[PDB]
Amino acid sequence: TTYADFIASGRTGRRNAIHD
């Protein structure tokens, strides 16, 4: 399921703003 794919992904914790 999409829910299982999200929870298994590396981006379920707090997400930082981007840097360039």
Added chain:
Amino acid sequence: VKEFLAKAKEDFLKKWENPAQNTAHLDQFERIKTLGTGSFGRVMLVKHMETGNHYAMKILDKQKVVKLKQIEHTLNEKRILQAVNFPFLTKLEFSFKDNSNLYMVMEYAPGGEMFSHLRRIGRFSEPHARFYAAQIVLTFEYLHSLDLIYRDLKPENLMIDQQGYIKVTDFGFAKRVKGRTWTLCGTPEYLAPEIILSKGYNKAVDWWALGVLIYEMAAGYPPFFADQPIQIYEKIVSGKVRFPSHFSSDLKDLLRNLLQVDLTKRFGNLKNGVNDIKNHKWFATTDWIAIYQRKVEAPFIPKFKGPGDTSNFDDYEEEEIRVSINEKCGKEFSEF
């Protein structure tokens, strides 16, 4: 509403053109706990000793801000937040600087961040999501009328107060701009396709980001995710969104109109502006006055434990606030 906005603008413009400076000092506060951190620095719960009022204090290290090329953005943040006043953001109660650091003192929101409640519960019902969404629609209406773009909508930035209402926080990328702007900034999942594609963009990125937020609140995950940012951007620019089957028709329709790559079709951006959103069917049960006036009952209230209770936040390593004997980056931050 046009009239409410006009008066708010007169109030904002006075402060914008004549910003408040050096309105407190560090020794006027007791520091109680770090609530959060990031590339900006730290947010701390502090108590103002003269009044015993608790506040959130953001502490930026001038030299780190310089290394990160965030001088102008930090100046933006401070100049904006000292000039605004709105129920769903936290203006600056005090600001000051010393040799080493920059300080912004704001109303403290004890309920924690939406992100943590959202992840733990899984997802919010459409009614629950709609309650939060409405507070965002009103804050963006307010902000954009002042020529301000926010540029970092996400659950991590939405702090829950004691009544279960929202404060929009972290204005590290907010900018007063009357035309287009070009800075690549924001958070990967929430970036509009125009940003990713290095086009000049406008406030319409804020409305795209609302689309992402409503989706994420209602589904429990974002419309575009993957393990790495570049995978996320390909998904955003293709633009194909799949809605969970539990999503109502009205929800999908609004989301199609917010998550719209075509800027001539994206709601919030069109000739009718914010009213395309406020008068969409998904919001039909929303009383926009009662939301502003905070007379609607929140779908979730966090438990009263004390005005200085920090249990809805994480624990972090508590490091000192080192103040050099030499003034760092005086010229860079002279107007702060």
